Design a protein around this nucleic acid. Structure first.
Ligand SMILES: Nc1ncnc2c1ncn2[C@@H]1O[C@H](COP(=O)(O)OP(=O)(O)NP(=O)(O)O)[C@@H](O)[C@H]1O
Ligand SMILES: Nc1ncnc2c1ncn2[C@@H]1O[C@H](COP(=O)(O)OP(=O)(O)NP(=O)(O)O)[C@@H](O)[C@H]1O
Ligand SMILES: Nc1ncnc2c1ncn2[C@@H]1O[C@H](COP(=O)(O)OP(=O)(O)NP(=O)(O)O)[C@@H](O)[C@H]1O
Lengths: 480, 486, 480
DNA sequence: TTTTTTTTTTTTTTTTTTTTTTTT
DNA sequence: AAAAAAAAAAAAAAAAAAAAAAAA
């Protein structure tokens, strides 16, 4: 027969929607109809495919060629449809045995020499192909991007002849290159209490507010914090890489498994810091996925932008919807905020500037003082690295909390929060007494319980103790 | 001569308007013409249908073909016009007996091998076909989506050969898979999670039992949002006839309902920064907004003082009528929006409050049946664990089911949707009740609509008390839920 | 087969994307198909190429032509695609040996007689071809514009026959004509102290602050401060030329191998001073790239634009976006600011309204005492031409500084400025009592250490000896 | 008094439909 | 002979200028 089927993937936003390239060589006169809502592949892929096939010592059908791309009601954007179309034409013309086209995808754009150039935003395609247990044969120019995954059964090719031989024959095509922290917690000299609070915050996945005078080192703590976080798992690292390449370029292989850290400037722009429209562009909120987001000088952020942060903090994703489409763009980040503890009624106005809806779901608050000149001038003779052991500790604590349930201590709800904390009478009377002394709100009490559970788990205690609650109180409260 | 008249459906908004594909072969040179305002997505079905016909071992006419997908005013958008066109071509080429197409509606998309593909937004077409008594034939990929309807006159096929064999000889096609029966026992939510907010928990229970809109006022931290979220569990499951109306909107806007919550009342909580186009109706080819997506469910408006007033002013029409006539200067769609409203507001963010107040629309707050002040939860009921945790959602849901069922006796409409033949009459106000109402009204400075929206609330309370008439104590309870602001 | 590849450039904004023109001659009927999102100006080059080849005593193929222009997803705008396409056609038709087209890059449109014509925005293409070490061949009309940069290995032709002759047998092809000011640092009046402060600032790359009565000086010394900095390399000169070209003017007479100097007036503009809008254009900040930015009367301007300078001051670039594109311009400069000693609370408010976060980044501060008649005896102070020796010393200083670590003293962090300053016990002893005298912030302390390291490294010292630290204490910040 | 922010209006931009000059 | 190259209109959104409401 003269009917062939091929597979590829079109990237809209962050998802790679599967496409089904269908070629049917009729018996009429030379034609190359390309039905399916292609925009720039319509009249351009035709000539590139023709020349690439001819120059690779192949017969180009002298027939009526009809190419139908995937779902009809789906615009198709990229230029990587030249390789699937060329292979479909060859299969339909019997120059390739089509019995071996079932399990393989194809992505790439063909030059006029038959060579394979490199398309953009390829890692999402690799993810989708591996998820479906399909071989993904890409151009050599994308070998660097594809090698991050190290997924087996993926290959790369130099030109079309290499792929045609890999299909007709079984020659190994190219495979992939095997797999082509510097700050450390130690640099934070003599802060003690704040460092320990940040350590337990990392261990519990809590969000922490850093209040202190200017030049106290808040930004340094935020920058060094990401060393605490455990190295991203393979799947999380691949998700981060996918969200990255949608924007272009990849200076990876030195940090590809270190959690992201974003510190948007307090001016920024709502569309940039939150999602993105037009062709869906992830915002600074989304590049922090599985990582840390540092909102420096929180009050100077406009409340309108901060109001949107309530969605991703609670859902783990942020969907931005336009008249055209709405995309997922996961935003499962960990928040860190910084703010000056006010300089009079000016203090009241300053605290009024801040967005209560966001500040009420920040699980922690630590006050930072300027350094002691004795420690500031003393040398960093205590150069022993320590972030390594703390990272292993955080891994252990997160594993415990996952063992309890899929929700970290930071994401427990009221019912599960009360069910997981033992909260015996011994601690209950003290808790009632303190609440009588200081009037915590409904959610402040549960934040206190969550932080107390984090501390208790850190100490390996099977149950929350009064000492743990007394410790958690110090890291509790908002503002003065 | 040979011409064929195949039927199909085109969706414009929520209604699937019938379309009559009309193929006609002439003896001229082998061209191919499509009329009837065919969009590009459907104007390129020419070669696709040609290939799907040739590959299925048929004879594609070498003749001047002329398709007429039109009532000439309606533009055709979907991609499901390939199966009707292919069958029309075959019937007009005498390869299919034209009497087989007597009362069938075909919806499908053809690949280049004849294999059928799944179109989107199929539920409205299935509903329309069922209402028209026509047989419907769809691609296998839509069998899962159309299984909810449970209509016995729908068939699914794998490729064009299957449909051709069915029409010519009737080889039974494939029927649709069984309806997805499931349970809801858990809900993972429960009415019990609300700890100690007893007074305001007994006011949502008589708003679920009377369709009354409810306004939640209170300081932050208290469980206004949590109570709103739990409210949906109170409402009874949706009657199939209503779950289909909701599933049509779900398919049109989103895709693939969950098959488990498809009979649970919807709960939508739009975020105040969302644009009016997303909240009310929609531009472009019209798409349901949040308001319509909450059809037959609960619309939770959090932070009522917020939201552009252009939106809150438009909610009067859905609350009175039940549908939003979104206009685009070319046509207006219906988009049913019969929802139950729940509001949340902060009574105080001096005389500066005048700026914060009046940002809302007074008539909207006048349309809200109830207002309950969520007091901050006290320490004794906050520290104390859930010593009592027996499930109440099931029992209360049974109560509301019974209360609704009884409520349809006098009038099917719920006591909230009851007019001045109900504020007077249905509410069998007695003499002593008349004097009590006279005294309280004269003492209280209330508008004329103030007198109304107690008779309905009092009737709801009486119905919960199984009293033939209001006993002068139900009115006493009702008064406590009226009033407004601080 | 009949298949030839040529190279050119496509200039958008400040970057000249590489484009690989690909030409294929098939056996079909006469035709001319372009590919790669070629605009009307590019896509109309068919007839121009045909006539230019025909009139140059060449043979235009009767076969079917098929030109594929570089990346398939990059629209092509410029009109300089006629020469690459003509050369590609000739190479594919065996009229030229295609080995010559290996490393050359061709630019410039073709008249209907075969004569070449100039094309706008040529400097970015020259820069890009320089970075890639590719022989660029341009129209003779563009020689008068390209040669000003003084870049070699670039040849200019008048007609297609000249280029064909050069490629076939290397017949000269002309060359960019030759490229066709004292400022005498010694001119500055007898300030001595401020001269030494400027010298250390240049040596270490520090940002310096100037104080004195309005118009009493500063600007006179600010102008000549640029003379001490080392001469720009060829690549840096071409970068500055490209930025000034996208601005839209570099005929003038600028000697591009010397550092620029920009002195925006304090009225300023939030768009011109930072970055251009509407059509992205370089702001005054980027025009100072690899130069000196002089912000006279710092208290002027506004408390927002000075915040946007925090990023480029350290990162070295400015990113301007309007949700439609992300445009990056280099902003590596050595900020020099000036301020009068304010015009009591009435005088405290003036310095209290300053941009504290940005001022904190200005390492140095000196006082310019006014002169009346002392310098009127010009001989014996102006008659030494002191610029050359200072520049030589600065070159050696930069070389040694970069040798110690890949960062100038002015861009070290709290880590290196302790591992490199290598203060012992007495050295660390002195600064403790100094800090006890004045408890400066951590940033001020590290600025002191950096200035002291600069001074020590000028004296061929192995460590930060006391004398150097005592000298560095001279400047500090003395806002009052 | 001695001084600044917030909100609205006008102008502008982008996208889509329309349109208007194409592609064959 | 058939659309896509284009000056126009509207939906929707954003920025700068301006009004003014507010505050030093
Ligand atoms: N342990 C430490 N505590 C505080 N500052 C430190 C410490 N170690 C080093 N520093 C230095 O202290 C300086 C303070 O800058 P930074 O850490 O950014 O504070 P900041 O609060 O972010 N700046 P600002 O927002 O204007 O107040 C940096 O230059 C650090 O290198
Ligand atoms: N019985 C209760 N009453 C009030 N709040 C509760 C109760 N039990 C738990 N909560 C808290 O309430 C949260 C959810 O409701 P809520 O505090 O109202 O969130 P919200 O979105 O901020 N609504 P609001 O309190 O009005 O701002 C839970 O996460 C708990 O922290
Ligand atoms: N004088 C009256 N006598 C009897 N019924 C009345 C009277 N005035 C109002 N109503 C009733 O009020 C109900 C609601 O109508 P109404 O409140 O007038 O609508 P509306 O005018 O759009 N609301 P508003 O904009 O606040 O005036 C009607 O169904 C009547 O029963």
């Amino acid at each position: 027969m003269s009917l062939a089927f091929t597979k590829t993937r079109s990237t809209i936003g962050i998802v790679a929607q599967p496409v089904s390239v269908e070629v049917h060589l009729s018996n009429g006169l030379p034609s190359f109809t390309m039905v399916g809502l292609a925009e720039t592949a319509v009249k351009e892929s035709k000539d590139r495919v023709r020349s690439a096939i001819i120059n690779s010592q192949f017969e180009f059908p002298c027939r009526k060629i009809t190419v139908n791309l995937g779902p009809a009601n789906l615009p198709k954007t990229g230029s990587g449809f030249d390789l699937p179309i060329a292979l479909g034409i060859l299969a339909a013309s019997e120059q390739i045995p089509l019995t071996n086209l079932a399990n393989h995808e194809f992505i790439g754009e063909l030059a006029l020499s038959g060579e394979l150039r490199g398309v953009s935003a390829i890692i999402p395609a690799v993810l989708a192909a591996h998820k479906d247990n399909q071989h993904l044969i890409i151009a050599n120019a994308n070998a660097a991007e594809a090698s991050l995954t190290g997924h087996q059964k993926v290959f790369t090719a130099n030109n079309l002849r290499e792929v045609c031989d890999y299909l007709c024959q079984g020659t190994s095509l190219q495979s992939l290159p095997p797999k082509p922290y510097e700050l450390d917690w130690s640099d934070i000299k003599g802060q003690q209490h704040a460092k320990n609070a940040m350590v337990i915050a990392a261990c519990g996945g809590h969000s922490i507010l850093l209040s202190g005078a200017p030049g106290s080192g808040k930004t340094m703590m935020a920058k060094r914090f990401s060393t605490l976080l455990p190295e991203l798992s393979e799947t999380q690292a691949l998700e981060c890489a996918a969200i990255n390449s949608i924007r272009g370029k990849l200076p990876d292989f030195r940090e590809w498994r270190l959690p992201p850290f974003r510190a948007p400037h307090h001016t920024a722009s709502p569309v940039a810091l939150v999602g993105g429209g037009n062709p869906p562009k992830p915002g600074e909120i989304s590049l922090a996925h599985h990582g840390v987001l540092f909102l420096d000088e929180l009050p100077e952020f406009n409340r309108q932008v901060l109001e949107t942060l309530r969605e991703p903090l609670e859902s783990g994703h942020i969907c931005i919807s336009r008249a055209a489409a709405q995309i997922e763009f996961p935003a499962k980040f960990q928040l860190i905020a910084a703010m000056n503890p006010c300089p009079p009624d000016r203090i009241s106005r300053y605290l009024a500037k801040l967005s209560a809806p966001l500040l009420d779901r920040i699980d922690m608050q630590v006050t930072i003082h300027a350094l002691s000149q004795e420690e500031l001038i003393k040398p960093n003779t205590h150069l022993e690295k320590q972030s390594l052991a703390i990272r292993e500790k955080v891994t252990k604590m997160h594993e415990i909390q996952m063992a309890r349930q899929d929700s970290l201590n930071a994401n427990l709800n009221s019912k599960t929060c009360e069910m997981v904390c033992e909260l015996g009478s011994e601690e209950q009377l003290f808790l009632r007494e303190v609440m009588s002394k200081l009037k915590l709100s409904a959610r402040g009490y549960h934040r206190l319980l969550k932080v107390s559970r984090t501390i208790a788990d850190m100490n390996s205690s099977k149950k929350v103790l009064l000492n743990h609650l007394q410790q958690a109180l110090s890291y509790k409260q908002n503002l003065h």
